[PDB]
Design an enzyme around this catalytic site. Structure first.
Site: not given
Ligand SMILES: NC(=O)c1ccc[n+]([C@@H]2O[C@H](COP(=O)([O-])OP(=O)(O)OC[C@H]3O[C@@H](n4cnc5c(N)ncnc54)[C@H](OP(=O)(O)O)[C@@H]3O)[C@@H](O)[C@H]2O)c1
Ligand SMILES: NC(=O)c1ccc[n+]([C@@H]2O[C@H](COP(=O)([O-])OP(=O)(O)OC[C@H]3O[C@@H](n4cnc5c(N)ncnc54)[C@H](OP(=O)(O)O)[C@@H]3O)[C@@H](O)[C@H]2O)c1
Ligand SMILES: NC(=O)c1ccc[n+]([C@@H]2O[C@H](COP(=O)([O-])OP(=O)(O)OC[C@H]3O[C@@H](n4cnc5c(N)ncnc54)[C@H](OP(=O)(O)O)[C@@H]3O)[C@@H](O)[C@H]2O)c1
Ligand SMILES: NC(=O)c1ccc[n+]([C@@H]2O[C@H](COP(=O)([O-])OP(=O)(O)OC[C@H]3O[C@@H](n4cnc5c(N)ncnc54)[C@H](OP(=O)(O)O)[C@@H]3O)[C@@H](O)[C@H]2O)c1
Lengths: 242, 251, 247, 250
Positions: D149, D18, D12-14, D136, D16
């Site tokens: 979640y 990651g 998941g590094g595409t 999280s 955000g």
């Molecule tokens: N943003 C926030 O405020 C926040 C807060 C607390 C925790 N988090 C957690 O932190 C992590 C990063 O979140 P983020 O907001 O940077 O982005 P995100 O939308 O949670 O996605 C993170 C990465 O996961 C990949 N991904 C999603 N579904 C997938 C699948 N079925 N197979 C492989 N890869 C998959 C996405 O790639 P693609 O979209 O290109 O498929 C993206 O690169 C996540 O686990 C999220 O739940 C986020």
């Protein structure tokens, strides 16, 4: 005949949570020795109850008083099933307004006083008996204006853990209740405080002293496989609920 | 990794974890003032570092000395990015052996002195800056013979939390590191001998899940991450304990 | 008359701590509907308790059967004061040997089935009622061989918190008990041999140096259910100190 | 030079946080393989980095795809020093509205997929390496609309603990990071409208004690600290949440 033949010491039982705990103990048929500082509160108790309860005026902060307290308890009760530590004081001020005097005062009662009271009274505790500490929701996290109180209670919770470990060979359990806002008794802002507890507690009300009392007596007599643990009576306040 | 233009105070930086922290700060370009209570430790510091760092004999337990320290810091550094509270003492006693004197000693240094030192020095702390406390894995749970020490550290962690909350309008972060059996010349316990320390270290090797003691530098790295890189972190704790306080069911 | 007039549902109340909770309920005067899978267990409990219990064979993992339990519970009990989620399964294996099938079995029961059972039965719970989840001391920390089981209970504990928050406007409290090693006459089987070896482990790693009793867990569930009226989102250890970091 | 000679897999590094971690890895000289489900996002990664990074469309939810990724990682990197499990999805629903399908989708990515990915790739991690999970602030406590979640991340944190214990004799550390309202393109909830993300963002600025959202880089720095500098740290959790999860009564 639940608490029949049981013997308890409540430190700070003249008032509120301690007193609610005393009421359940006595109505359950236990013999109780309680302490307090204030002359008026002791006077009321000595009238309302009589020699089924022993009210002793005794400052938790005075180590000399503690020694005499231990001598009297041992004489009166002989050996006990529950030691409940309830006495606590608080002075609300921003961190940079804390003076050495106010700091010392709160730790004298809430932490040091409690430690040495526990140290003196622990040999009276029968195998299978327990210690229950009254802590606070403030014992975790950061609440502005409560730097000293919160910290004195956090230290007390740590003491409960090490006491739980060191008292294992003696078969004495050691636990803590963590109350949130409890409605009990300067009035006009004692009033402003109860409102705050109403607004900010997830259950949107204050706890009753009897609710704390119930939690204390559960840990004391029913939670027989529970030691070194903490029990919330806070309406959800310390539980990370949005 | 570079602290050029940064200024830092290390309370208790004359050996072990605090000194390791001093070394990285200096090597990264920080201006540093450190304290200690022992005088010959101070002499050694002045020899290792020279006029490069400011080293002051200053008892953390003494409120007069804290005032003197406050003026010194304001005079030599003026305004700081990091206050590291590292100073600690410990005396191992079973709970019924603890005296008023030994009780008072450990809270005087580990809790009260830390509180009032932070009270006096916080006005020097700039916006964006931070305070890092050194706690212990003993700040949680029950460890026999360490009732007073554990409680004094538990108290310090509480203070860290309230400070994190109260200092939010100043943009000052407050966090804590929790070691950890750390291979250090005191082992955290000054009273004992070399013999009783080598055994304390071995106890560390046996009961630490990672099967070793930590290094002082490993602690230092964690302090400086919290101080300078963890810019969205406050009121938090960071373990440097080889897993010891993390509830790993070995062994 | 302690639980006079009260009505409760115990999900997985056919054996052990779920059964000890059923007993204390019925002895205090409550009417209980319980579920489980074992034919003999269910038959036995029907026999023992008569009209005070309604014992249903119901797979907590089966969402079709959860729907039927909902109709049945609503038909048999109507409004209730306590939902106790006790059902759980464990498969001990090192992380690198966990199969998709074994992973799925534990989560289907311990977590998803719990979630959808709570979702289906919550509408029956009276104001002032509560939910109690049986977790485990394994819900925090790292115990080799129990990756799946531990995670599944950790998810349950999380559910409990969010439910405690979502159910505040209904006046429904949501809490958890976290048992350590609890001991379970005189019947033979390979389960009952495995139970023995585990009991022995519990005796010498638990700080209090013994297993807990089912009644000890039951007393804690029923305290949280009926006596802790200012407690929600909370956890209560019945583990002889195993979860509390005592060296 | 600080990650010179190191090899990492970011799951998941595409985009955000990651992606912020990947970028930091590549600036430091690391060789990186990253995954995502969105093939268009993968195309954008190759546009940015070219061949200095290996980028694969790989669905974390699919065990067949995990097996394939395991082979590809072996062929491409051989052995690695860091495995970062970052992939996640969230769907905000009141508890009484959670469907079997929505529940399954979130646990499939957040918990099960994470587990079998780690199971398949752990053999590649060498001496002194580590695994870091992105959890999280929701993995503790009760946040309405987030029952699924939160439980799925709570499960992930338990896995980290058991893995930290089981991986001890291999000298492999395992830790988690816990954001934090973080300013990312999805805010961790891919399926909502931008009106709802903006509100989610505003909510973040109000309830967070430090009164702002965190940056992706701030999370990346904590992941890489755990990966390479916290060499006496295992089974631990690191908050990157502006105080949100730390009980500040502000
Ligand atoms: N943003 C926030 O405020 C926040 C807060 C607390 C925790 N988090 C957690 O932190 C992590 C990063 O979140 P983020 O907001 O940077 O982005 P995100 O939308 O949670 O996605 C993170 C990465 O996961 C990949 N991904 C999603 N579904 C997938 C699948 N079925 N197979 C492989 N890869 C998959 C996405 O790639 P693609 O979209 O290109 O498929 C993206 O690169 C996540 O686990 C999220 O739940 C986020
Ligand atoms: N109030 C809350 O909402 C709240 C919240 C969290 C925790 N707590 C904790 O709950 C405990 C009891 O609270 P409460 O309801 O009883 O109200 P309180 O006003 O805290 O009463 C404290 C009790 O301790 C006694 N006491 C004080 N100093 C003493 C001394 N030197 N020696 C002996 N006894 C002494 C008092 O008796 P006299 O007044 O007769 O001396 C009183 O009975 C305290 O430890 C407090 O920290 C309370
Ligand atoms: N070592 C461990 O394994 C371990 C484990 C857990 C926690 N800790 C904690 O980590 C911290 C560092 O411990 P350590 O083993 O590296 O060394 P330590 O023996 O705890 O000493 C730490 C520093 O504090 C100073 N100090 C002691 N008393 C003082 C006073 N009254 N006023 C001012 N400064 C004073 C010492 O300087 P002088 O000796 O020159 O006065 C020393 O530089 C301590 O707080 C300790 O309790 C250590
Ligand atoms: N006992 C311990 O030492 C221990 C240790 C750690 C945690 N725990 C936890 O404490 C709780 C009670 O443990 P326990 O030892 O009593 O577990 P147990 O011995 O397996 O019994 C659990 C109860 O749940 C029921 N159940 C199991 N699978 C079910 C399904 N698919 N659908 C419906 N009901 C089902 C069982 O019914 P049947 O009898 O009909 O199969 C049984 O009545 C469990 O959740 C467990 O995870 C126990």
């Amino acid at each position: 005949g639940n608490y029949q033949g049981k013997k308890a010491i409540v430190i700070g039982g003249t008032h509120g949570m301690g007193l609610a705990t005393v009421r359940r103990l006595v109505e359950g048929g236990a013999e109780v020795l309680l302490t307090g500082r204030n002359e008026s509160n002791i006077a009321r108790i000595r009238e309302e109850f009589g020699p089924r309860v022993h009210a002793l005026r005794s400052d938790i902060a005075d180590l000399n008083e503690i020694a005499v307290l231990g001598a009297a308890a041992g004489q009166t009760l002989g050996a006990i099933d529950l030691l409940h530590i309830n006495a606590g004081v608080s002075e609300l001020e921003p961190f940079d307004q804390v003076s050495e005097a106010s700091y010392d005062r709160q730790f004298a009662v809430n932490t040091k006083g409690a430690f040495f009271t526990v140290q003196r009274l622990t040999p009276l505790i029968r195998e299978g008996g327990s210690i229950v500490f009254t802590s606070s929701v403030a014992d975790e996290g950061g609440h502005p204006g409560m730097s000293v109180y919160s910290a004195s209670k956090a230290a007390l919770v740590s003491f409960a853990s090490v006491l739980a470990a060191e008292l294992l060979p003696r078969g004495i359990r050691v636990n803590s209740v963590s109350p949130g806002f409890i409605d009990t008794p300067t009035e006009a802002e004692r009033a402003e405080f109860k409102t705050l507890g109403d607004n900010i507690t997830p259950m949107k009300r204050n706890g009753t002293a009897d609710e704390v009392a119930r939690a204390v007596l559960f840990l004391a007599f029913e939670a027989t496989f529970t030691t070194g643990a903490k029990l919330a009576v806070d309406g959800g306040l310390g539980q990370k609920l949005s």
